[PDB]
């Protein structure tokens, strides 16, 4: 019964990920056409696993139903935009939000206000129209925009998360020196363009 | 020259148009299968016109050799071909796509209802599509050739007769065309009844 | 326990499908390079679902273990080569078997000896070396080679299989007239090359 | 001429070589992750040399402008770049690939152990690969550039300094190179300990 509703959820949010991905790749493709630089290194897509969706609903004391999840959970559809340089992150943000049918919903900038452990990434939730066979759906998609250095750090830290406390200090040490080397590559890249 | 640059610009933006068309179409196919357990689309082929065939077509129509003329007058710069599993899937795809707010019909030629003299059959619609670029919006036409697998199989062989040698197989092609429609009608009739 | 063995099975037979697919596409790509014709229309790959694998093992009274399935089941890895013309089928067969590291295991030609219901397809099982991280595996892969007409017929018939008996007769009727129209396209295509 | 045809032949067969190399490499990456829950490869890039850059390289080395010479003397006609997640993954990929019966080492240059003067770092191996064509077998060389993500990030920026402007950033590049190796050493050291 309810499970059908969640299967429906997985399907339409997968479609949302397709329309965003096409938008993003066109922006990357056109920017390189004009300025001979690719802002995007690569992208990863993911529809939230159901058991993680149910876990998150319970952590927030919410009902286990697809319509509740559709309301309260904004990262059912997630895309991760790994960029080549630090300024490419905000370039992607500007290019996408300027589009008529893209609506900002949430913005959390962990680059300028990093988490305690050193995590850095730009998180924006945007709305996207998805034209289905017999219906239109405007669905939220969480976009994690980051540099390659931020991505490699987040990968190592993710795989850890009672073994976090040991490496917590020098992970933050790595985080810091990743930002410093990427700052230096950015300043060089800024100057050659 | 500046023009050749213009044609490179043309190839780039019409390639992007094909990306947005393809995502729309595959979502429709994916959602229809989700609801009704049937895939209207068998496969799709994309193509941006070669510059050298684009220049040929401009000259064949007595038009100027410029990107601004080509954008206006040539509607098959971006081409997508939607090969469908059954004949009724063709018009289903058309209906589903045109009802979308940002897709506008521009040209329609129904060679299924009114086949060509040689037996060619296909639905040809040109639609307009918004393409959001880095610093600009472009609304671009895309020619969609919607057809069955049988129609595709026939059109491939006929295309490979050309390139004074069409007259020989003209009759024997017209027979293949006819018997393709007849067998596909019957598979359509069976598929309708079991759904 | 045993389930681990079947997970291992799925992984290595998936890799087998990758090496075959690369072989087949190179052959198709080279044939078109030389003769300006593409024998292959498209291909579908599939590793057998486990519950269907366990079902098949029970139907044959065999043990439910990965090593037994690896021996007795030759269609764990399946690839389907849908060809443009009838003669392309045997062209693909010739091109692939001539390769040094491809070994024929089983051949059943349902084109010349169609099944009672009208099914037609060339079925060959071949062996393929798969170089893994720390080990080599020579694995069987079932190849179903057919025309587009044979494929469309098989699709309609598969989806139906107590409702087979009704359409059984005119399915065979369709089967026959598919072969006749494809014969005529073949004779024309033979003559233009 | 007949030659230009020869170079078209060259592009075709070396593209096929890249397909067999890629399938081997991805299977190794896929199997290693299956066993040890780690992906050595982050991503891969493929490339067949442009004919016009191939002609340039032949002239730079005083060689004849023919496909038969290029096949013999130029080993980076087919190029693949294996970007790895950690430094030790680089040599792991090399070991796994060369131990295969039908892969033969042809050339090896280890710029990781002996970096270039500007700070470039990467493992360069040319290997031979059998390519089974429709009517013929070809054993073709493929140049493999194996590197970390940091090495890739650095090499991209340095490549975009060229194309009398390298001297300015030469020192500041050499620093970036160094601190990339140092941060990647530490991430390697952490990753080793948690496995
Ligand atoms: N926007 C995003 N896009 C692509 N992948 C993402 C992503 N967010 C997380 N991932 C990755 O998807 C995998 C599974 O994530 P989940 O457990 O389902 C949600 P989460 O990462 O815990 O975010 P949450 O804390 O907001 O709920 C993780 O390994 C993560 O790295
Ligand atoms: N909408 C479309 N979708 C997919 N492929 C198409 C297509 N239109 C043409 N093609 C294919 O592109 C290849 C080269 O033909 P082109 O010159 O580019 C267009 P055309 O078919 O010649 O239209 P034209 O007769 O008005 O000039 C052909 O193989 C053709 O089948
Ligand atoms: N060699 C093959 N390659 C690709 N797909 C195949 C295939 N053989 C069968 N399929 C398709 O895979 C889907 C699931 O097949 P399965 O039920 O797992 C085995 P099967 O089709 O019953 O063959 P079997 O009777 O020899 O056991 C079917 O819909 C089928 O059309
Ligand atoms: N093994 C390889 N794998 C992936 N990309 C490669 C590659 N070798 C070169 N490339 C890329 O191909 C693009 C054009 O360079 P090419 O002229 O084709 C070869 P090259 O790097 O100039 O070698 P060369 O200096 O010996 O001539 C560059 O962006 C380069 O990074
Ligand atoms: Mg999240
Ligand atoms: Mg046209
Ligand atoms: Mg089978
Ligand atoms: Mg080189």
Residue numbers in the entry:
A (entry chain B), C (entry chain B): 33 to 193, 198 to 229
B (entry chain A), D (entry chain A): 32 to 194, 198 to 229
Paper text:
Central to the stringent response are the two unusual nucleotides ppGpp and pppGpp (collectively (p)ppGpp or alarmones). In contrast, short RSH-type alarmone synthetases only contain a synthetase domain and lack the hydrolase domain as well as regulatory domains found within the CTD of long RSH proteins. Members of this ‘small alarmone synthetase’ (SAS) family fall into the RelQ (also: SAS1) and RelP (also: SAS2) subclasses and are found in a wide range of bacteria including Bacillus subtilis, Staphylococcus aureus, Enterococcus faecalis and Listeria monocytogenes. In summary, RelP always appears as a highly active alarmone synthetase, while RelQ can switch between a passive state with low and an active (i.e. pppGpp-stimulated) state with high (p)ppGpp synthetase activity.
To gain further insights into the disparate enzymatic activities of RelQ and RelP, we attempted to solve the structure of SaRelP in presence of the non-hydrolysable ATP analogue AMPCPP (α,β-methyleneadenosine 5′-triphosphate) and GDP or GTP. However, we could only obtain crystals and solve the structure of SaRelP in presence of AMPCPP. Coordination of AMPCPP within all the four active sites of SaRelP is guided by π-stacking interactions of the adenine base with the arginine residues 78 and 112 of SaRelP. The ribose moiety of the adenosine is coordinated by hydrogen bonding via His190. Interactions with the phosphate moieties of AMPCPP are mainly established by lysine and arginine residues residing in β1 and α2 (i.e. Lys80, Lys88 and Arg91) and Ser84 contacting the 5′ α-phosphate. AMPCPP adopts a kinked conformation that is enforced by a magnesium ion coordinated by Asp107 and Glu174. As all ATP-coordinating and catalytic amino acid residues are strictly conserved among RelP/RelQ proteins, we suspect a common ATP-binding mode and mode of catalysis. In stark contrast, the G-Loop of SaRelP was well-ordered and could be unambiguously modeled in its apo- and ATP-bound structures. Our analysis demonstrates that binding of ATP proceeds in identical fashion in RelP/RelQ proteins, because both proteins harbor an identical architecture of their ATP-coordination site.
